[PDB]
Amino acid sequence: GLLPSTVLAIGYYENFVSTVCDALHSLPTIKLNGIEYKDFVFNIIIPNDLDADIKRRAQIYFKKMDIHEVKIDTNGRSFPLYLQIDEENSGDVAVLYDMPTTLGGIDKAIEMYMIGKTSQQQLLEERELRNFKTTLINLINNNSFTKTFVKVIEE
Amino acid sequence: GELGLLPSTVLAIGYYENFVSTVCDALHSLPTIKLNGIEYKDFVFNIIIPNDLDADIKRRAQIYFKKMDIHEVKIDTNGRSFPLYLQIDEENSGDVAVLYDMPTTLGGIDKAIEMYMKKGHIGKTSQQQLLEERELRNFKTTLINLINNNSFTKTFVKVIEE
Ligand SMILES: Nc1ncnc2c1ncn2[C@@H]1O[C@@H]2COP(=O)(O)O[C@H]3[C@@H](O)[C@H](n4cnc5c(N)ncnc54)O[C@@H]3COP(=O)(O)O[C@H]2[C@H]1O
Known about the structure:
Chain B: Keywords: Antiviral defense, Calcium, Hydrolase, Metal-binding, Nucleotide-binding. Two copies of one chain form a homodimer. By secondary structure, chain A is of the alpha/beta class. The first copy, chain A, has four helices and seven strands, in the order αβββαβββααβ. Chain A has helices at about 5-25, 55-65, 105-110, 120-140; strands at about 30, 35, 40-45, 70-75, 80-85, 95-100, 150-155. The complex binds the ligand Nc1ncnc2c1ncn2[C@@H]1O[C@@H]2COP(=O)(O)O[C@H]3[C@@H](O)[C@H](n4cnc5c(N)ncnc54)O[C@@H]3COP(=O)(O)O[C@H]2[C@H]1O.
């Protein structure tokens, strides 16, 4: 019984999480926005609901938390990926953030196969956010190039 | 019935919302479209939908781009949210830039169905390959309906076969 949240989590893991960790794992020395790091953590922000659109929401979170854009050029044919870095207090570890824009799909999808967000629809979009977070945590913990390097957190 | 919203439906929406209309919006915005230094008078954006999920999507796409002699191109330029990487036919594009992409999102259906299979087999079962089949068809139908229901994509994006 495949939940959409489950496919989306796997899509985001294979095509974004792994791709980013690999890019950073392939640099002899990690150098982000021209400062050298000895290690990294990659924080996946799960939103608490789908009331605000994810791109709008993420932008608010990153401004609020004063963390700024950084492009990581992938070690494949030079394709930079987009994410946010918290460059604070001369830390050795590069503390990176993303909020999965793929979650947008769930809001639009739910609101398209249904005015006012019913507690029934709220409990449905709640269930998907948790299923996505749970799948994602499982996938991360199941590969040595992602485990210890990736954190799934709440907004 | 509990919402029978297929995964392929949500993935097709996400691809449309966060990629197809992001690309069109970047090209519609350009006073003149300039790709790898070339001016184009308009564009068409072709979404290659794979016939199956036998081959991994990125392996597949490489094969299609290489067999079509299509080339890498960077769009959205700079300081426009984030840059995008596409494939263009520099050989047969005149006034119209012909752009390609194979949805990498389709890659999540394979690995998902492969996870949820309750046993290991040499290759794949007929039933397994039936689910893949009908999920790719739903994605194409969902994308074609999304594309056609908007001025900003309707003439500009086309779903093609591998
Ligand atoms: N370059 C990138 N920049 C930022 N986040 C990235 C990313 N590549 C992947 N992700 C994240 O991973 C999700 C799944 O990516 P996937 O490649 O499987 O599926 C993607 C992919 O097929 C396409 N797409 C989106 N952004 C793309 C990009 N910059 N280049 C190429 N394809 C992109 O649209 C699908 C849905 O994207 P969506 O945002 O809904 O959801 C994306 C997004 O949340």
